[model samples]
Target: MIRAVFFDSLGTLISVEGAAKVHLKIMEEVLGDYPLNPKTLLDEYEKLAREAFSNYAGKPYRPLRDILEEVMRKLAEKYGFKYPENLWEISLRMAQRYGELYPEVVEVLKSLKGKYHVGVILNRDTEPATAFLDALGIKDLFDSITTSEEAGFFKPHPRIFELALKKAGVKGEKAVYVGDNPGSKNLGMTSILLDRKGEKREFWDKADFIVSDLREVIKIVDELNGQ
Candidate 1:
């Protein structure tokens, strides 16, 4: 039932210190010299950012950069530090350089590449998204790369996924999106949550399948195709 396999870039295939630590990476650079604890800053940013994203759909199409900036500004105030003027630029660069591949990423992609149309559907800008994949040495493995900036919408909006499906030359039912985010719930395709921690959280219900290891994704694809 699946012809193409799509993955989320940050937490799915590549990670920073074992997970998608976007906030941690950005904060460490933007506020690295500040006196506050990193873990608290991450927790605070998550609280604010979560609230921001929860209200985003059915609203104006705002760049994640803007949202991130707003979040950082608030954090700077709460922590009494100067928010760097070049935060957005620093973050873009940090994103491109931060990730280290999960152990099974290349193996899983290698197995999936020849058998399926592999792609990355990311909530990121075009430049850095492509750059990171290239830096990771997996750019050539993908049949297509679609980003929110190029598509003009973010996750849970459905349009971006539709655009990616079109780019991959497949229908929604023929594609499976494996990501660590619950935002993938609204994509009009099969959704798999790569819950590497095995939390079994309530969000697990949103996924058609869940696997802690990406290698298991290969078997899920195989079984879905009745191979």
Candidate 2:
């Protein structure tokens, strides 16, 4: 029987509102005469930034500012623009404005309360992640939080998942991990892919379940509990 529900942070429960779009705008502002498509650059910038972060998951944790700096520099170079060396600091300032909970997040967490232990296992540092959750007004809802900063490893690695499950006092089989990333399958639980944008149908076969909304997760929990 499932006794706990684990969620991935960031894109799953919370997100940076207009994350890279702000940076893209800043870049354009810095390049007043450069002609470019904001929409196209936004797409490429997101891809590059995600890859930069994901590829470094298993290594020693680096500050997000450094990672953002590298991503910003690469984006500027790729787009034929130039930003001051301190662009990262500027980007970071713009980034602080981005903290939002999805519309369904709070409702879904409320529904799950008193039924199963709810926790968050994320590849993020405790400080900023906690701050972001608190900003979303959902910090008190979680029973536990396991971050890569504390675990000394990132998700998809057994240690991170093990630490979270251990902290929740639940076994892998008795927990359900919900995340927007396909990588959540590595948590060794019944994984639910939260494909909110309907862009991951091709990877649906890999998840125990796929959902477009957090509300859908409640039904899945009910069915799983019944069995």
Winning model by lDDT: 1
Cα lDDT tens digits, model 2, 42-161, are 677678878977788677666665676677677778777765675544444544555456788888897887788899887877876776566556889888888887877665567778
Candidate 1, superposed: residue stretches over 4 Å from native: 20-25, 92-98, 135-137, 181-188, 201-205
Spell out the clash pairs found in candidate 2: none
Structural similarity to truth (TM-score) of each candidate: 0.80, 0.75
Best by TM-score: 1
Indicate the TM-score of model 1: 0.80
Give residue 170's error in model 1 in angstroms.
1.3
lDDT of each: 0.77, 0.75
**Model 1 C-alpha lDDT per residue in residues 1-227, reported as the tens digit of each score:** 68899987566776657335655777787777789887788888889987887777534467777787888888888899888899766655665566578888888888999888888887776776677777667888888898777777766676677778898888888989888877544456888888888776878787889888889888898898995
